[PDB]
Amino acid sequence: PLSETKCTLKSFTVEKGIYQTSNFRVQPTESIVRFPNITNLCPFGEVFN
């Protein structure tokens, strides 16, 4: 965190105080996909041919 403050302030030394920094955010652990499972295909064959 100290070196991240150094990165933010673009200075090799940081004075006493409190400094903002890029916020933290828990990343998505995995992925979820929810389609309505449906059998029939779309009649693109009838559309085209």
Ligand X SMILES: *[C@@H]1O[C@H](CO)[C@@H](O)[C@H](O)[C@H]1NC(C)=O
Residue 29 interacting with other proteins (CB under 8 A): no
Residue 19's nearest CA partner among 32, 31, 8 is 8
Q: Which of 3, 13, 23, 29: binder of other proteins (CB under 8 A)? A: 23
Query: If we measure between CA atoms, which residue out of 45, 1, 49, 46 comes closest to residue 23?
Result: 1
Determine contact, residues 9/22, Cβ cutoff 8 Å. no
Among 20, 31, 39, 49, binds other proteins (CB under 8 A): 20
Residues that bind ligand X (CB under 6 A): 36-38, 44-45, 48-49
Binding site for other proteins (CB under 8 A): 20, 22-23
